Each structure stands twice: as C-alpha cells, then as structure tokens.
C-alpha cells in the first residue's frame, strides 16, 4: 500500500518542479557533498585529486615549451630549463603529483632560473591544499552521519493491542542491537489519516500526537533492554474509535524514537510506520528477557518479534 | 521600511563605540577566524603559508650569509655549508618551501655541519605546523556552519488571515527545498512594536511571544512536507485588537523556525519577518501538496506561495 | 548478587540470536570501529598502513617483472625500466612504502616508460589515501568519547534515609574529581524490582522513575561541590512501603547523572545502582566541604564517603 | 569577600585529598590534555615531535654500530650499510627527521641490505603518525573550547532594584559583543547563603532557584540586543524579606546565561555574580539603544553600564 514511512523509517516523498535548484546547491556546497550519492562522490575524491595533477601537468608543459626546456627544440648545453628533467608530458605529470601529493623525489625539481614557474607552484598547492582538505572533511562527516546507526535499533514488526493493567493499550516493543548506549531516547508517534477533496490533485494531511508511555510516561534515560511502549486507548485517544477492528481504516501510525548516542553526542532518530492492517488484537509480546546463572540479563533477540494471543 | 529581520532573516542591527573591541577579538581569535569575511580569510591562509615560507627563506639565507656559503664569497674547495646547494635567496625560499611542504625533492638538503641550522629547522617545522592546523580548522568549521543551510528552508513571502476551523486564524506556511531533513523544529514568533520617548534618542522594544500551532501547538518531528502553521487569533492574542485592517500599525511579527539538523547534529535556525503591510486579510493558501499514480506525495512549489481568496 | 548496572556504572546485560548482524555490522562500519576493542584496533591501524604497502609491493614487482626489470632476466643496457633501481621484491616494498607515506627519498622513482605504473601509482595513492583518513577520523573519536571521563565524578559508595528539614528522606552524595566543569547536570533515578512468573523463562521489569532534589528540585546549573541529592520518602514515594529495613527487599535503585561538559559540548552521563543491602538507615553524610584563610572553599574528599549516625 | 563565582564567572573552588588522581588522569588522557595549561601543553607538542626524532636517531645510530657502518671502524670498499650516508648520530638524527616528517631529501635512504631497519622504519612511522594524531587532535578541540568565547558577551556589573510596571524587580541587563549570534539563551540565577555549624569545619549551601523574565518569563531565542533580565520581588521570591537594604546579608546571587552557539554548534555558558553590596536600590538602567538615519538600531556600549536614579 501507499505509505509515509517505509517500514524501516525511509523517506517517501519525492519533491517536484522546484524553481532554482541548481544555483542553490552551489551555493550550499558543503551539505551538498555530504547529501551526495556514495559512487558520485568516490569519483568526485579521485576526480579532484588526479584532475588536479593532470591539469597542472598539462600547465607545466606548456612553461616548458614556452621556454624551449624540449629536447628535440635542441636546446643548447648553455640551456638552463625552467625545471630540471622535464621534456614530456608525461614527466610533467609526474613532476605535478611527486609536488602536489608532496612525493618529492628529486630526479625532478624546479630550478632558480624561471620565476613564473615558481608562483606557478605556490599557486598549485595553495589550490589543491583546498581541495584536499574540503573533500577529506566532507568525507569524514558523510561516513560520521549516525543514520546507518539507527538500524542497530529496531522496532517490532507488529503492533498489539490487549489489556494492560486493565487499561487497553496499543503496544510496541523496541531494542537495541549493540552495547554502545542510547541516551535521552524519547518515543513519539504521529496518526496520520487521508482527506480527499473535490478532486485527486491535492491532500491535506492531519497529523495527531499520540503519546507513548512506559512508567510514568515521561522518557527513559538509557535503552538497555528491549523496551515495552504502550499507549492508552481511552477516550482521550485519537485513536477511540476508529474502526478498532481487523485491518480496515485508512490511516498511518507513524513512530519516531530520538536521542542522543553516547560515544559521538549525536542526535540519533529511528522511524518506522504501522499500517491498519499491520496491528493486531488481543496479543501478548512473549517477554524476551531471561536471566542466567553468571548472574544479570540476557536479552534473546529470537522471542523479540515472537506474540501468542491472550 | 525599517524592519528588525530582513525578510530572508539577517540581522539589521549595526553595533557602535565598543570599547576594547580589538585586545577581546585577540583574545578569541578562533571565532574571530570563523567569522570574519571570506576574502580576507582566503587572503589570510595563502599569506600564512607563503609569507612563513619568505620570512625563513630570507632567515636561511642570512645564516648562509654568515657562514659564508655564498659562491662569490669565494668559498674555498673545503668548505662545507651549513646548508648544501643554497646560495641565493631565491633557494633559500625554495628550500623553505621544500621543507615546510615536505616535499623535499633533494637537491638542497641540509648538513651535519651546522647546529643552529638544525634547530632553526625544527623551529619552523614546528610553528608551521601550528599554524597549518589553526587555520585548516577555522576553514573546515566556517564552511561547515548551519547558516548557508537555512536557505533551502523557506517561509511563505505573505502571512494571510482567515477562519480556520472557525477560529480567526493568522497564518503562514514553511517548507524544505531538500530531501534531508530538519528534525525537532519548534515555531515560535514575537512580536515587536515602537514606544518613542520624549526623544528620538532612543526606544524601547517590548517582545510579545506569539505561539504557533500545527495540530496539537506543540512541535513537529519532522518537516516532510510544506506545513502550514497558525496562531488563534482570539483574546488570548497580543494580536487581538491591532488595527487589523490594510496596512496600518507600527509592528513586526518576527518569526524563527529552530530545530535540529539530521546529517551533522547542528541547530539550525531560520528567521523571517512580516510587516503591518505584509499581511493579507481573508486569503486561503492553495494546497500545495497533491499525489500521483507511483504512489506518495508530491510538494509542487509553484502554489507554495500562491493564494486565493475564501 | 545479580544487578542491573555495575556499582560503577557499566552495563550488565548480553543480547543473543540476532540474526544477521555481520552484515549489519558491515553496514555501520564507522560506529563499529569506533566501538570495537583497543586490541584489534590498534592492529587494524597497523595493518591498514603495513598492509596496504606489502600489497602494493607485490603488485610493484609483478609490474617489474612484466616488463622484464629484473637483474639476471639480464636486461640490455639499452633497457630502461618500468621503474628505476627495482629489481628485488624488497625494493619494491620500500617503494611502495616511500610513495605511499609520501617519504619519496628520491633513489627509487618513477619513469616515463610505463604509462600502467603511472595508473597504479595514481590509485595506490587515492585509496590508501582514503583509508588513512577513516582509520585517523575513527581513532581520534575513539578517543574523544566522554565515557572514560565519567570516571571523574563519583557517587557516594552508600545511599542513606534519615530526616532531612523533617522529612523522611533517601540521600546520596555526587562529586567532580577535575576542574572541569559539567553543565546543565540533571539527576535521575529508576527504581526496578523483580517479576518473576511460570517460569524463569521470562521476566517484565516495572521501571518507576524516582526524582531527586536539591534546592528547588530543578537541576544544578553547575557541579561546582559534593551535591547532596535526596529523596522524598513520603507516600508519593514508590519507595514508601518497601520493606525499609535492613537489607531485604527485591530492588535496584538505578542511579542516572546526565549534563553537558564544558570544553567539548558533549553529554556525558554517570552511572551507577544501589542493591537493597547498600541502603542504610538513619545515617548522616559528614558534611565535606570546609572554608580555608586564602578565603574560599576546599572539598576534602576523604570524609566523600564517610557517615556517623544521627 | 569571600565569593562563589568570580565576577567573571570563573570557578573559585580547588579540591583537595583526592585519592588516585594520577591514574584517573592517565586512564582520560584526551580530557587530561585537553584541560592542561597552555605552557605544558606547547612544550609537551613540541617534545613528542623532536623527542620521537631523536630516539629513533639514537636507534638509528645503534643499528649503524652493530652493523659497523662507521667510517673510522674502518668499513671495506665492500660493505653496504644499513643506512646510506649515516655514519655520525648527527646523520642519525637527522635521517630520523627527514623521515618521520617525511622531508625524505634522499641524500641518506634505507638500503635492502638490512631487513631489522625496515621493519624498525615501519615502527617509527606507525607510531609517530598515532601521537602526531592525537597531540593535534587536543590542541584543535583546546582551541575550539567556547569559554573564551563567552567573554564577549557581558553582564551588567550592577544590579539594581525598582518598580517595573509597578512591580518591584530586581534588573540586570546582558549584552553581546559580537556580531556572531547566540541561540536558545536562557537566563537562571541562584541564590547563595551562608549557613554555619558549632564548628568552622564545614558548611551547607542551600541552593534556591531565581527565575528571571523579559516579556513572557520563558527564554529569548536570539540575544541582538542589550537584554534587561529582571526578577519579580513579591512573597514568591526567596529574596522578599532579605534585608533589603544598603549591604547587609550574607548571600550571592549567582548568574547563569546558557545557550547555544550559531557558528558551532556549541553550549555556550556565561555565568557572574552579586555581593549584597553589589546590589543597588531604586536606580534604572540608561536606555542603550538608539536609531539612527540610515534606519536600524544601534548598541552603544557606553551606556550599558551607566545608570541614573528613579
Ligand atoms: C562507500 C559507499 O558507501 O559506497 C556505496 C556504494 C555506491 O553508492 P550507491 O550507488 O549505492 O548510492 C547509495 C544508495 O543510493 C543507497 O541506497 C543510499 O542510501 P538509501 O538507500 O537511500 O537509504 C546511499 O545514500 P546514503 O545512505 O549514504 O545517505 C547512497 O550513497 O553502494 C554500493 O555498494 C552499490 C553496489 C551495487
Ligand atoms: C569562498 C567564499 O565564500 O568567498 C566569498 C566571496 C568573498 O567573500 P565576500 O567579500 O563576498 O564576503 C562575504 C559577504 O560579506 C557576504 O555577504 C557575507 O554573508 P552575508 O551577506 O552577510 O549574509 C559573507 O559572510 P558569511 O556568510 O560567510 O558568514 C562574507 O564572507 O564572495 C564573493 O563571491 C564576492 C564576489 C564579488
Ligand atoms: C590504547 C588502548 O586503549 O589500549 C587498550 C588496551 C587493549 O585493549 P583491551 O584489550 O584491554 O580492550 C579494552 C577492554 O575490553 C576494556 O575493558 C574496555 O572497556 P570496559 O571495561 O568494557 O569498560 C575497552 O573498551 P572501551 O572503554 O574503549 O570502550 C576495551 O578497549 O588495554 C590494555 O591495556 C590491556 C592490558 C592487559
Ligand atoms: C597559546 C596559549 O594559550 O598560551 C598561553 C600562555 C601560556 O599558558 P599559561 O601559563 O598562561 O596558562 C594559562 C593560564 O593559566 C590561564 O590563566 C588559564 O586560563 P584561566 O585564567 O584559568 O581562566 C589557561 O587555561 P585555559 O583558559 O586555556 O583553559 C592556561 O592555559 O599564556 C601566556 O601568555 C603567559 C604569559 C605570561
């Protein structure tokens, strides 16, 4: 079915005729690089990197013809080149990267006697320092980025409702598949429903908080263990009513989990989306928390999804 | 007119007769660097580099003076430079360059001989490369800044009033020109008018706090499409008896858009401003969203700011 | 006994059965590094470096070889090589290494002949380029992350109930063994007991948030000396009709500490628990903080953890 | 006097008797550096480099002798050294730093002759790009600390108590002395006093929270101009029946300014405070904003301090 969310907490929008795109991503470079596809981008890094080198080869070429530094121009023993064993091309280029990258072998070095050649160089470098040190940034924070992080939280694939303590509640369980911690974690759903108008050329969206309690409702401050949310079906509940029964309802629940991570101070936001057919009535989460001999708890991820009915 | 926010959200205050203004720059010189223009901080890192290259060539080139290493000094077959191959300041700027780079080719290296020579080097080894950091920082993080972000958040150019649900509702509408999102957002607008004092020496701003409200007037997750954002204007309203009508009265409705960033943990923070004239009276923004046959919404930013009368 | 958290803070669980986590792991390769051992991490850098080198040594050679540059292949004098003055595997490693660090002493280099060794070369140098820069990036954050420095505040070893203004009161005592300063703190304690059923197959854990007060019942802006924190035991307590006495009762008052740090903007959080045995009654924090001639205040942390009986 | 924070809002506390300060440094060794002096932290970068150099430059010298490379051991016209060129522990030292900096002139170079000095090349490399790594990493993160930030923004140096809007309050005014903005400030004293026991040994401070106010008591997202902070003094205040007179009392009025940082990302926390002699009775602050021709409003810092009787 159509959906907000993808089950895993993708985006499911595309955006359309958006006037001035182009110019306003040069503008934002940097966010622009970051936001860019991983291939694109390798090839960007090595582009730069090698382009620069191939460029600047090219331009000492040209100083060396301009200078007569080619062999067969027969240049006279008296000659003295605006670089030292420079008479190709392909030297060239080689000469720009043992510079640029700062190889330096010395086979190939510059001399005293052309002054362009030397601002040519200092220019080289300044540049490709740049360079270098902007896509190494951008790099460094595209890897950083703590979404691929999220999916080491999960939710539950099913959503249940039952009696707990007496109160009808909506539920679902989450966890966390590592060791590294979870801070500051807050659950917060959204009810998300379809309005159709006169026509099929537009939709307004009602979003409706539902709020997702453990103990007193409030937060919890680390994800230990997998936590049980629950959501009170009374009649404070946008939820009341609906049509409680098997799979019909046009609607999206919709759960967001923030929080902060412990090891980078990032925040950390998981998603994902309950459909009205995705929610089942009258089950039980078989609990999934055992302790052992050693001595504190365990956490077995194979119960996790597991339900049986009341 | 005169106005608080520019409309895209820049400040417009200048500030005057600060005492002291240049020791406390010196003293944070981080954020001074961060800050300050982009010419002269291009102007800063090329001049850092090639200017700690000149001043130790010309060093190098003095201490070669004093040993006498220069060739028309007559340096007979014995002698040994404290540097090999530098007799001209002209090497002496390329060995500084070799060295501090480390590109290091070989045709100038230094010798055994001279002592002081070796801790100059190190000397200027270890200061550049202060300085190289500093200054890579500074770049890294003035490019990294949220700012620039902002633009591709943007409000409608007109707030419009109307009967919402019923209620006198003084509305506008925000959207993201990007598929990355903003997470934790919160609205929140003041509002600022003109007391004059027996002069026009100076003046007093009293700030109103003026809330905004989506569905529950609480915050929104997350801004996946345009979201159109109301305030009741009933007698809970700093708003209520304005002259209400075209035009008239001496205020400005500040309203900032702050949240947090998904791919780097930054706040960001937008601003804009509506004047007395702004604001449009019984206008009903054209719904800007609309679905298509592949499944999932679209945001079509040609009505964004398009309005029609009710 | 069997506990929640570790009297220092560290968590006490182990999950089981996830199901694919390599991939998963593969996946989010950046926090995995960042959260893996010090062991296999230093020799994942080493062997990065190294590794990268002895494999782009063989490649060198099997270049050489190709071509024919060997020694007693007997190369014609008319022969130039692939790449000067390598003719034995070793030499070839040593290149690899002097290009890739970047060491380029200059007796082994490049030559024009071979446009292949050029290429591999070029992609020598961008990935091991790349690689470089994420072991760096994952080992400075490693590093940096703010658990290690949570070691630096301390609670009391033992929590304590007596009347404090009247009131029946839980009291334990926190403290910052650094100049440093940690902000915007905020105390947070869960009360968890013990659920058994059928079986020892499963177990619920009921958290119960319990606050913890210390002026206004607010938060400390600053941790600036040993902060008293106290609870209300009145009958809004979960803790009311405990078993008060000594020693029995089935529970773990888990103890959170969560604030910002002053010179890294990172959040840091302190943990620790107090079993049913650790809690003591009628007992009285020797007061710690003593005032001395120079005129402000010392915090002698011998009497941190001393108590006499009221 | 005696006083809790320094006027500028420097922690006035030392800590004494801590036991294992030395190990708990040594395990947090990245906080450790980056709170170490300045002085000790610049000698400490530049002994990590060159004290590397010359280790491994006696190292190298060692390996020299027991392979007999020096010239006086008399080596035969047959012998390869270990090293090239290296027959004094100058040399040594000196082949040390072309190539840890990785200078590599190539007037010395390692040899295939000596397998034990490659792997010990390796080594050093390894090593000494992990501690470059890290000294570099404390002194960017040292430098980018926002304490020395929050000296541009100010405090009055008085405050000073009236009837605003009827109401008695007690005022101060904050001002910013950068054109960099600060975001989500929020404004919480608290209030100091004095208790004493039967001895001099020891003393409790009891904290009380002063909430301060601007227009809806809440928070002020931007700080553009000179803000006047004040606190409502009816039967809520914990000041009420202070003697609110000239001086007398035994208490401080600690100022606390946190908030977020616009170039960085950063929590930012400028904290001052008030002696019962600071404070002053029945005086109004000099408006200290004015407009000016060219249309928007101006800060000028002459008057911010200034004051004139009621
Ligand atoms: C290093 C590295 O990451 O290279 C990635 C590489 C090439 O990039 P690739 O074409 O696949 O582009 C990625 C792809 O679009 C993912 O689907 C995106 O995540 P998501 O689905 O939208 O969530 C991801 O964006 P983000 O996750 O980084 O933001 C994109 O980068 O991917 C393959 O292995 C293709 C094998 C065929
Ligand atoms: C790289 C790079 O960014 O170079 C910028 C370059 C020179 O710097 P430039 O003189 O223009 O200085 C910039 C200019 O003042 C902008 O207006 C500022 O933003 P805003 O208006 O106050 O909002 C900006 O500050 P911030 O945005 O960085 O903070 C300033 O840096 O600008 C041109 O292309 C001039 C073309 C003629
Ligand atoms: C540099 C550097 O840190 O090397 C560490 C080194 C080897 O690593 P090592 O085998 O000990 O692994 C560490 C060990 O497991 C600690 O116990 C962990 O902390 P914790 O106990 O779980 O809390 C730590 O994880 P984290 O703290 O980094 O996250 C692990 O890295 O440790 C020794 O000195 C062994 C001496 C025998
Ligand atoms: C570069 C660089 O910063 O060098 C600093 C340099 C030497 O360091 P220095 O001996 O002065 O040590 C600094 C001194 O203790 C300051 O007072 C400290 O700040 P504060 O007072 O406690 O607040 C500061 O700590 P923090 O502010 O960095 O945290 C200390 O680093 O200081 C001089 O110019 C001495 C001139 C005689």
Redesign the interface.
């Known amino acids: 079915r159509?959906?907000?969310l993808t089950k895993d907490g993708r985006?499911?929008?595309?955006?359309?005729?958006?006037?001035d795109?182009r110019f306003?991503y040069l503008?934002?470079?940097?966010?622009t690089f970051?936001?860019m596809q991983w291939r694109y981008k390798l090839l960007l890094?090595?582009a730069t990197?090698?382009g620069t080198?191939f460029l600047f080869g090219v331009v000492w070429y040209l100083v060396a013809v301009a200078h007569g530094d080619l062999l067969e121009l027969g240049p006279p023993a008296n000659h003295t080149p605006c670089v030292?064993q420079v008479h190709?091309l392909?030297?060239a280029?080689?000469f720009s990267?043992?510079?640029q990258?700062?190889?330096?072998?010395?086979?190939?070095?510059?001399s005293?006697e052309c002054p362009l050649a030397?601002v040519l160089?200092?220019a080289q470098?300044?540049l490709t320092?740049?360079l270098e040190?902007?896509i190494?940034?951008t790099?460094?924070?595209?890897?950083?980025?703590?979404?691929?992080?999220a999916?080491?939280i999960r939710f539950s694939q099913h959503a249940v409702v039952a009696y707990h303590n007496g109160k009808l509640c909506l539920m679902i369980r989450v966890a966390n598949?590592?060791?590294?911690?979870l801070?500051?974690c807050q659950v917060?759903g959204?009810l998300l429903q379809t309005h159709q108008?006169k026509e099929?050329?537009?939709?307004?969206?009602?979003?409706?908080?539902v709020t997702f309690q453990?103990?007193?409702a409030?937060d919890?401050?680390?994800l230990?263990?997998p936590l049980?949310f629950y959501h009170v079906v009374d009649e404070t509940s946008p939820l009341k009513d609906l049509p409680l029964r098997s799979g019909e309802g046009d609607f999206e629940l919709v759960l967001?989990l923030?929080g902060?991570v412990?090891?980078?101070?990032?925040?950390c936001?998981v998603?994902t989306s309950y459909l009205p057919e995705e929610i089942l009535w009258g089950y039980e989460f078989?609990?999934?928390?055992?302790?052992s001999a050693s001595?504190?708890?365990?956490?077995?991820?194979?119960?996790f999804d597991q339900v049986v009915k009341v």
Chains 1, 2, 3, 4 share one sequence.
Do not use: C
């Open positions: 159509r959906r907000v985006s499911n929008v595309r955006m359309e005729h958006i006037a795109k306003l503008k934002d470079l940097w966010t970051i936001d890094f090595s990197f090698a080198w030292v190709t392909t030297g280029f080689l990267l043992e510079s990258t700062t190889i330096g072998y010395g086979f190939r070095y510059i005293e030397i160089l200092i470098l300044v320092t740049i040190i902007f190494t940034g790099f460094l924070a595209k890897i950083a980025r703590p979404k691929k992080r999916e080491t598949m590592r060791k590294s911690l801070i500051g917060t959204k108008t099929g050329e537009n939709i307004r969206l009602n979003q409706v908080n453990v103990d007193t409030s919890s401050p680390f230990i263990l049980t967001i923030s902060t412990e090891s980078t101070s990032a925040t936001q998603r078989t609990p999934a928390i055992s302790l001595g504190k708890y365990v956490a077995d991820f194979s119960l």
